[PDB]
């Protein structure tokens, strides 16, 4: 088998010291099984250094465990040297446009199955055969959990910022005009603080009261319109529809989302804008968003929602545009066509899928 | 603050959206809405059991 690292579906944990697998207990404290994997432990797919086995478990792995306890076939698992979900690609001598990553690693003919959350779609189903889906999803959008910077910060940022300079200049001019001493300056300051000559003083007091009332009203109006949080309605928000520089948004390369946008007509300039900063891994984009690098990460439902509910800084708002279902892949008409489908449907009816979902997808943020 | 908030409530409950609305589906005594007797609209609203 070949699998791609995706949480909360499969976990990648390095082997401890000698070579044993660390034991873990779940929320119930019951044992959680795991197996041994081999892959590029070194780093990102650059220099191919040592490939020491690691411990793997999650949501897909125990599904394969149950699928294997029936039809009793012995199995070994190893990750993919590429690290991308097998899309179409050309070469410098493009006359075949073969398959990279997961699908190619199975299509080239050295692996048996695909156990990973790969979205089923038309052209994949044409070139490869799937089974009955066991999870449905639709890709949403996320963003940082706003910004709580509104705490006595707009001291001089209420649109026009000339308030303090204008007030000081007017007070100084009035004090100079009325000067016909330190006591006079203190009285003028008190006029600004409510701590002939009489008529001028009364007029100045009225002017100061009017200015104070106007300033209070302006501050209230400025601090009544701080409500924002556009939150992105969906893919039909004009703000993201126009490609701008301060609201960059992208998606992992060589994956389902890229092929879905690149094939469906809708428009071209959105794909052009997104292709500039398409990432190279599945999870590093989440860290980039959490830092501040990206503000809209287009990715499919389950993983996005679980990550959003994992760390209390990322939330999703939208309408769940487009829909599909995760499958379980395999070669073109392998002798294992029917039993996998029968077992997956029996489990789907039985409720085992519910047990797995409740075990490995739960909430901690709230 | 409370007076400003109360005065901020402008143009409230003065417009009706459409045929489907809580005001329309259940008036009690004050929101009578009617039309002219046995005209084209009457048989249309009677007919469509939807």
């Amino acid at each position: 088998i070949v699998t791609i690292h995706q949480e909360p579906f499969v976990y990648v944990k390095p082997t401890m010291s000698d070579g044993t697998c660390k034991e873990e207990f779940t929320v119930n404290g019951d044992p959680v099984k795991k197996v041994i994997c081999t892959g590029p432990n070194d780093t990102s797919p650059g220099s191919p250094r040592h490939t020491v086995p690691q411990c793997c478990y999650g949501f897909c792995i125990d599904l394969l465990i149950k699928l294997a306890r029936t039809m009793n076939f012995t199995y070994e698992v190893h990750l993919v040297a590429d690290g991308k979900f097998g899309t179409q690609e050309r070469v410098n001598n493009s006359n075949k446009k073969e398959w990279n990553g997961m699908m190619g690693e199975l299509l080239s003919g050295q692996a048996d199955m695909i156990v990973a959350p790969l979205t089923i779609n038309n052209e994949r189903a044409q070139y490869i055969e799937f089974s009955k889906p066991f999870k449905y999803q639709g890709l949403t959008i996320l963003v940082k959990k706003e910004i709580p910077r509104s705490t006595l910060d707009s001291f001089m940022q209420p649109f026009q910022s000339t308030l303090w300079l204008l007030v000081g200049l007017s007070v100084h001019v009035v004090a100079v005009m009325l000067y016909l001493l330190s006591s006079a300056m203190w009285f003028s300051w008190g006029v600004l603080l409510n701590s002939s000559a009489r008529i001028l003083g009364m007029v100045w007091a009225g002017f100061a009261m009017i200015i104070v009332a106007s300033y209070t009203a302006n501050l209230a109006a400025f601090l009544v319109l701080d409500r924002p949080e556009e939150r992105i309605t969906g893919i039909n928000d004009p703000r993201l529809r126009n490609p701008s520089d301060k609201f960059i948004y992208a998606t992992v390369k060589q994956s389902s989302v890229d092929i879905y946008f690149r094939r469906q007509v809708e428009l071209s300039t959105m794909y052009r804008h997104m292709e500039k900063h398409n990432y190279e891994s599945a999870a590093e984009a989440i860290q980039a968003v959490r830092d501040n690098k990206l503000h809209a990460f287009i990715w499919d439902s389950a993983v996005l929602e679980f990550e959003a509910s994992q760390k209390c800084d990322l939330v999703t708002t939208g309408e769940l545009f487009f829909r599909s279902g995760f499958g379980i892949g395999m070669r073109k008409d392998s002798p294992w066509k029917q039993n996998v489908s029968l077992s997956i449907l029996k489990s789907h009816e039985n409720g085992f899928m519910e047990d797995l979902d409740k075990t490995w997808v739960r909430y901690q943020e709230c | 603050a409370n007076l400003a908030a109360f005065l901020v409530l402008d143009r409230p409950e003065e417009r009706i959206t459409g045929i489907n609305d809580p005001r329309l589906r259940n008036p009690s005594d004050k929101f009578i809405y009617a039309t002219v007797k046995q005209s084209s609209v009457d048989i249309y609203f009677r007919r469509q059991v939807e």
């Binding site: 009332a213 009203a217 209230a220 | 007076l3 005065l7 901020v8 402008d10």
Partner: peptide, 29 residues
């Protein structure tokens, strides 16, 4: 009545004027 009634009337007028100005500014903005 230096301030038994005149002061109360002035305070009421000032409070009403402040509230009206605040409401007008809120409506305008």
């Amino acid at each position: 009545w230096t301030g038994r009634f005149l002061m109360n009337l002035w305070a009421i007028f000032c409070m009403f004027c402040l509230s009206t100005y605040t409401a007008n500014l809120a409506a305008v903005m």
